[PDB]
C-alpha cells in the first residue's frame, strides 16, 4: 500500500551527527512536497522542515530551531527523502515522522477507482526515535515505596537511574491490575530516567497479601523482582 | 512565519457533546492552506480535515471544519469514546507550522486526590542519593499544584512530576513528585512536607513525615 517508512534513528552523542532515511512506496513520491516532523517527549508537534518537488525547484524551508544545522534532500530515483542532522542537542531528542502534508486538490487522481471518484489523503511514517545525550546504558535501581506505619493503604516502587528507554513494570507478575498506576518516565539532570509505579489496595489486605514489584530492563537484560513490606 | 494558537488548552466534555475547538491565526491565512490532524498516545498524526472545510477521506462525518483566514473552527457534532485525544490545526501558507494542541478530555465530577508521602528507603541512602516522593491519586481536573517543603522551607528546582493518562472507569488523574537531596542535605533536615493545592481542597493538603 502507500507507505512512508523512517530508519536510521539512534543513540547519539551530544556532539554527533546522524542521518534518517525515509522510503516511500504506493504513490508517485517525485510529485508531493515531503516534509520532517518531530514530536519531543511529552510535547506537541513541531515542523522540522520541508523540501518541494523536482518539477516546482526543489526549495528547501527550515524551522527558526532547525536552520543552519539540519538539511533535507531527496533521491526520486530510490523515491527515498533524507534528513541530515548535525552539531545536535539535547533539546532534538524526539520522535522525527517522515510526512507528506497536504498536497493539491486533485494530487490523488486514480487512486481507488473501484471505490471512489475524488480521494485526498495525506501520509504518515511509523516514525523513528532519536536519542540525544551522553549517557551509557545503566541498569535500573528499584527502591519499595513503603506503606505508611500511620494509616485504603498505598505501596510502589521506584525505578530509578536507569538509560535508556523503556522499562515495564508489573504487579505479582501481573495477578494485580486495579489500582495500578505507572507513571510516565522522567529524565533527570544526571541524564538517567526514572519512574514511580504505585499501587493502592485496601489496609487489611496488607496483612494477607504479598506485594512483588517486577522491573524488565529491554537495553540492560535485567529483570528485577522486589517486596513491598512496611517499615 | 505565521503563529498559530488554539482555544482552549483544555476541553472537558462527556461522550454526546458537541466540541468546538478555536484556531487563531496572526495573519490572514488562505483556507486552502489550512488543515485540522488528530494525535492519540502512541499514534501518528492522523489527518482529519484539509483545506479549512473539506473532509479528508474516510474521516466520519461529524468532524466538520470552518473559518475564514484569522479564525477557524473545528466542531464534532457528537463526541465518541474514541474521539478524545489532541487536535492541532496546521497552515501551510507562508511557513509549515502547527499549533499548540488542543486535549479533549473526559468530563466528570471533581475529585479532590488522595495524598500519600514516602520516605527514601535505607537502600538508596546507604547508596548516596535521597529521594522522596508524593502522591497524588484520583483527582479532577487534571490542575493540581505540588510544593515541597524541608523543615518549612519551600524547594524549587529539585523536584520533578508526572500525571498519568486519564483513567477508562473513573476518568480521574495521577500524579507523582520526586524531590532528589543528597545524602548530607537529607541528613541535615528532619521534616519532609508535600503540600497539595487542588480545587476539590477547600486548603492545601500537608502530609509530613520526620526521620524515624
Known amino acids: 500500500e502507500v507507505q512512508l517508512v523512517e530508519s536510521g534513528g539512534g543513540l547519539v552523542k551530544p556532539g554527533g551527527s546522524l542521518r534518517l532515511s525515509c522510503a516511500a512506496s504506493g504513490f508517485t513520491f517525485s510529485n508531493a512536497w515531503m516534509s520532517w516532523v518531530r514530536q519531543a517527549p511529552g510535547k506537541g508537534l513541531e515542523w522540522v522542515g520541508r523540501?518541494?518537488?523536482?518539477?516546482?525547484?526543489?526549495?528547501?524551508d527550515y524551522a527558526a530551531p532547525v536552520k543552519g544545522r539540519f538539511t533535507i534532500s531527496r533521491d526520486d530515483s530510490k523515491n527515498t527523502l533524507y534528513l541530515q542532522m548535525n552539531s545536535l542537542k539535547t533539546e532534538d531528542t524526539a520522535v522525527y515522522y517522515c510526512t507528506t502534508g497536504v498536497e493539491t486538490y486533485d494530487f490523488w487522481s486514480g487512486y481507488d477507482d473501484h471505490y471512489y471518484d475524488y480521494y485526498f489523503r495525506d501520509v504518515w511514517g511509523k516514525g523513528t526515535t532519536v536519542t540525544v545525550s551522553s549517557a551509557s546504558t545503566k541498569g535500573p535501581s528499584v527502591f519499595p515505596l513503603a506503606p505508611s506505619s500511620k494509616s485504603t493503604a498505598a505501596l510502589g516502587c521506584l525505578v530509578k537511574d536507569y538509560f535508556p528507554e523503556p522499562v515495564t513494570v508489573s504487579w505479582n507478575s501481573g495477578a494485580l491490575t486495579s489500582g495500578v498506576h505507572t507513571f510516565p518516565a522522567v529524565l533527570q539532570s544526571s541524564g538517567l530516567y526514572s519512574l514511580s509505579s504505585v499501587v493502592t489496595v485496601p489496609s487489611s489486605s496488607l496483612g494477607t497479601q504479598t506485594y512483588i514489584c517486577n522491573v524488565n530492563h529491554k537495553p540492560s537484560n535485567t529483570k528485577v523482582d522486589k517486596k513491598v513490606e512496611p517499615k | 512565519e505565521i503563529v498559530l494558537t488554539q482555544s482552549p488548552g483544555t476541553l472537558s466534555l462527556s461522550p454526546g457533546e458537541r466540541a468546538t475547538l478555536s484556531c487563531r491565526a496572526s495573519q490572514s491565512v488562505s483556507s486552502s492552506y489550512l488543515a485540522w490532524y488528530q494525535q492519540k498516545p502512541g499514534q501518528a498524526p492522523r489527518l482529519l480535515i484539509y483545506?479549512?472545510?473539506s473532509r479528508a477521506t474516510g474521516i466520519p462525518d461529524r468532524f466538520s471544519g470552518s473559518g475564514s483566514g484569522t479564525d477557524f473552527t473545528l466542531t464534532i457534532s457528537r463526541l465518541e469514546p474514541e474521539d478524545f485525544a489532541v487536535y492541532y490545526c496546521?497552515?501551510?501558507?507562508?511557513?509549515?507550522?502547527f499549533g499548540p494542541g488542543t486535549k479533549v478530555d473526559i468530563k466528570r465530577t471533581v475529585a479532590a486526590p488522595s495524598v500519600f508521602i514516602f520516605p527514601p528507603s535505607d537502600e538508596q541512602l546507604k547508596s548516596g542519593t535521597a529521594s522522596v516522593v508524593c502522591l497524588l491519586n484520583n483527582f479532577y481536573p487534571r490542575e493540581a499544584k505540588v510544593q515541597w517543603k524541608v523543615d518549612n522551607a519551600l524547594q524549587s528546582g529539585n523536584s520533578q512530576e508526572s500525571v498519568t493518562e486519564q483513567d477508562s472507569k473513573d476518568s480521574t488523574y495521577s500524579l507523582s513528585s520526586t524531590l532528589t537531596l543528597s545524602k548530607a542535605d537529607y541528613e541535615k533536615h528532619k521534616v519532609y512536607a508535600c503540600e497539595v493545592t487542588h480545587q476539590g481542597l477547600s486548603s492545601p493538603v500537608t502530609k509530613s513525615f520526620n526521620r524515624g
Open positions: 496546521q497552515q501551510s501558507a507562508r511557513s509549515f507550522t
Open positions: 523540501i518541494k518537488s523536482k518539477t516546482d525547484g526543489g526549495t528547501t
Open positions: 483545506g479549512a472545510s
